[PDB]
């Protein structure tokens, strides 16, 4: 069985993980210095967000050199040492592959910008104006048009992200091969695989207003697989915001020779108004969350596909703050989310700080925000006459900076992340929420995660068991079996902050709970966020 089926992946956001040299920015030696901790937790691979040379307009996802380490993280020697040291701790390094677009400071674009007959011109996507305006109405994810005018040539170039992230032309065969060759450079270094940034965009065909899920998407990924990682025994996970369960199978079916799995984001729109943006808020309906969770467990054919499982990453807020309670039920709520996900079918991903229940970090004004996405939304909506208080509130609920606050190691200055002012200020709640405190408390969120990881590593039912929904529970209660041959485990979870009834004729032996353990479930009242795992007898 391929190693990643059994694995738990941990995402490190490098700028915010551990400063080791006093500039307020997390770095590679800092990550190296925390490998003992990650081994204690028991994770098998680190997904490392981008550490390549980058002007930082999108905090590293605007890459100016794919094969150089940005000096704010250290050197290639530091990258090699992390790979080697991590391996000694039984941890593989999964690099973030960002090949839909480059920095506008990438040599290819510096060249292409020179003019229509530059050899690199066709590495990007250039179009004449139409009727003295943009070629079409495609929008950037950071507000405004996806088309940026270039004065010297009189053409627009495409960018689905920042102006400074010009989109690469995947129809260009010379460029595809250079990308493959670059991927092989990294693969040859002994990395455990790639997390593939917005990889669903590479079939884009803007002339036909095609963005995600374009015709050439899967043909390109099959070509890519053959040319690069196809025989390598690495994990590839595509970031696919617009994947359905069927599309996820197309990406992950081993007989299609594409990727290992994909990140799907179906649940993200559950708390926004239909037909609008994530900034247009609406309360989450727990029943809808339940349905989405269940859909991805039951409608994926695991004989011909795989599945990733996550709550958090560098682009989305902390799950306990967003959809749960991060105040007096913080510990129970965090444990509930961990339990219900890690007993699901698929490979789990833990975002740095999730394992201690790090929360959102609210701001009072825009000068406390750094992320281009939030700032650009704020400025456009302010100009359009939206209520400024509600804009701040929208950032507090959906802003990506909530995910990017410095990792909280202890109760020292800046939570032990740095001895100087961090690039982005530490969440004031670090005094009570930090790794040192969590390790000292056996009832902490950290030991729940550690235990869930151990259970997965040591029990095939967690890895390969079928998922079967317990029928006819309340909308706010998610309960399900994992079933492997004659063995059957029951997971019962209250998704809500209020008491819920649960009824079952199963006889059980409890394995793990976030409340005192029960010895039956005949007719019970679940406490807020109460969640537990039981062997069914
Ligand atoms: Ca540093």
TrEMBL record:
Gene3D superfamilies according to UniProt: Glycosidases, Golgi alpha-mannosidase II, Oligo-1,6-glucosidase, Domain 2
An individual GO BP term: oligosaccharide catabolic process
Domain of life: Bacteria
GO molecular function: alpha-amylase activity; glucan 1,6-alpha-glucosidase activity; metal ion binding
Residues at which Ca(2+) binds: 19, 21, 23, 25, 27
Enzyme class: hydrolase
Residues covered by the Glycosyl hydrolase family 13 catalytic domain: 11-404
This protein's record includes keyword Mitochondrion: no
Annotated SMART domains: Aamy (SM00642)
InterPro entries associated with the record: GH, GH13_cat_dom, Glyco_hydro_b, O16G_dom_2, SusG-like_C
Alphabetically ordered keywords of this record: Calcium, Glycosidase, Hydrolase, Metal-binding
UniProt-listed Enzyme Commission number(s): 3.2.1.70
A Pfam family this chain is assigned to: SusG_C
Protein family (similarity comment): Belongs to the glycosyl hydrolase 13 family.
NCBIfam families: PRK10933.1 (NF008183)
Protein's name in the database: Glucan 1,6-alpha-glucosidase
